[PDB]
């Protein structure tokens, strides 16, 4: 603790060690893997129970009817970002008779985290979101790091055992991008990707959670009998 319990100092290697440390909060959380083609985006989250009499924790939050965010880190830290993303999405509908886009929303959120990490008595947040949505420009899937880094991909993952998921996605790359207009196949390819984020824990209907939005599809969260389809 010369720079290690201090959210205001630099940090002899151009870092802050607290941003590296907030990234272990994602490790201690579960895993979610997202993939998009061009006509659908998909989040597939692994939910986590606290014991067999304990329910499972929902890891997909609906933000809009064309937007949803998923967490794979701390839940009270995911409650800040969720509130904020929802406020700016409704604003867009009310004032400009517009829909909000993921790209733009990644930048509003970037700046929000930055200015709390600038402050002393602040923190770099203990969560990472993947934010999908289908807007005016098509699908977007952005990956939000505790650093705030937004990058636009066709497939990404966050959580534990994410490196193995990204191996899945580097193979299936041109398969999934060229399925367009058949929502079924994309969703089944995110189940198997996240089967390479397992330790052989298997997937049950109450561990597997899908939520999708297409061009012609709402943001809808699938669970129960509506995820047994896609296995």
């Amino acid at each position: 603790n010369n720079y290690d319990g201090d959210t205001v100092t630099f940090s002899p290697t151009g870092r802050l060690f607290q941003v590296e440390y907030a990234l272990e909060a994602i490790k201690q959380g579960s895993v979610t893997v997202g993939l998009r083609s061009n006509t659908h985006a998909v989040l597939v989250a692994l939910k986590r129970n606290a014991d067999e009499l304990s329910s499972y924790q929902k890891k997909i939050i609906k933000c809009d009817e064309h937007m949803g965010l998923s967490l794979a880190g701390l839940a009270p830290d995911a409650r800040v970002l969720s509130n904020y993303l929802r406020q700016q999405c409704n604003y867009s509908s009310l004032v400009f008779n517009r829909k909000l886009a993921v790209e733009r929303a990644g930048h509003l959120l970037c700046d929000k985290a930055q200015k709390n990490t600038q402050s002393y008595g602040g923190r770099p947040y203990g969560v990472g979101l993947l934010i999908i949505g289908y807007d005016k420009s098509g699908a977007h899937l952005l990956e939000f790091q505790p650093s705030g880094n937004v990058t636009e991909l066709y497939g990404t993952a966050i959580g534990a055992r994410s490196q193995g998921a990204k191996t899945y996605l580097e193979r299936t790359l041109d398969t999934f991008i060229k399925i367009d207009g058949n929502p079924d196949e994309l969703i089944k390819a995110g189940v198997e990707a996240i089967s390479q984020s397992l330790r052989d824990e298997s997937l049950t209907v109450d561990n597997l959670s899908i939520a999708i939005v297409g061009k012609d599809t709402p943001f809808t969260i699938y669970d129960g009998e509506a995820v047994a389809k896609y296995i």
Binding site: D6, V8, T9, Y120
Partner: protein
């Protein structure tokens, strides 16, 4: 950072007591003697100045006796500079009461208000307090003459005679062994002087290092008269009692 540089001096030690309240008592012992004795015709406050010097003017000085209001004045033991902030709060406070209820302030409210102010400064903020102890000579019509000492964290406790300041333990003992409840102002003047004389921090007790103030009910119309003596009237009584 900003937390790095934090005092943390307004918290307790494992004793369940603040670091700052204890520090303040040491410095109130550095400060010159101030004593109160309560006669049945008044209250004698007698203060010895902390400093004395060759070219120092102690003849326009009233550096230990201060009028808070007309019937309540104080003797000061501690830091002089510190005592002055609390002095002008007490003046406001007294007038505010006189302002609203059209009646002179009881002593009881006046002591307590100053106790609170010291208490806030030890409570929160990392702030230092005002380490001062006041000896209040006051009159009220609901309990006669009333006498009080106050402590650095703001607490008041009743007395019939008390001493705070330099060589407090030695002084306070001479006051206990002599005290009678039937004492008048004339006796009380002489006792106070003799006690100051046996605990002087020079080699004598002289008018130029003495301040003397009394509150008399023997005054015109049977009313309370606050009289803060000139150094030549302090010189006059000193020669009567035979120290000089």
């Amino acid at each position: 950072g900003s937390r790095r540089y934090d005092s943390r001096t307004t918290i307790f030690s494992p004793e369940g007591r603040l670091y700052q309240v204890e520090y303040a008592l040491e410095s109130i012992s550095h400060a010159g003697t101030a004593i109160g004795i309560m006669a049945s015709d008044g209250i004698v406050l007698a203060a010895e100045r902390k400093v004395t010097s060759t070219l120092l003017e102690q003849d326009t000085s009233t550096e230990k006796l201060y009028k808070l209001n007309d019937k309540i004045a104080v003797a000061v033991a501690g830091l002089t500079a510190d005592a002055e902030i609390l002095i002008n709060t007490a003046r406001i406070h007294a007038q505010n009461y006189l302002k609203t209820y059209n009646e002179d302030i009881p002593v009881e409210i006046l002591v307590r208000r100053l106790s609170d102010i010291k208490q806030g400064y030890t409570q929160h903020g990392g702030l230092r307090p005002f380490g001062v102890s006041f000896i209040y000579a006051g009159y009220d019509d609901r309990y006669g003459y009333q006498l009080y000492t106050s402590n650095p964290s703001g607490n008041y406790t009743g007395w019939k005679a008390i001493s705070v300041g330099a060589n407090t333990s030695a002084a306070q003992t001479l006051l206990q062994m002599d005290y009678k409840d039937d004492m008048k102002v004339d006796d009380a003047i002489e006792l106070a002087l003799k006690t100051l004389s046996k605990t002087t921090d020079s080699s004598a007790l002289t008018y130029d290092r003495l301040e003397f103030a009394t509150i008399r009910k023997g005054a015109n119309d049977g009313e309370v008269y606050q009289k803060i003596f000139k150094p030549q009237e302090i010189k006059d009584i000193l020669v009567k009692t035979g120290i000089t």
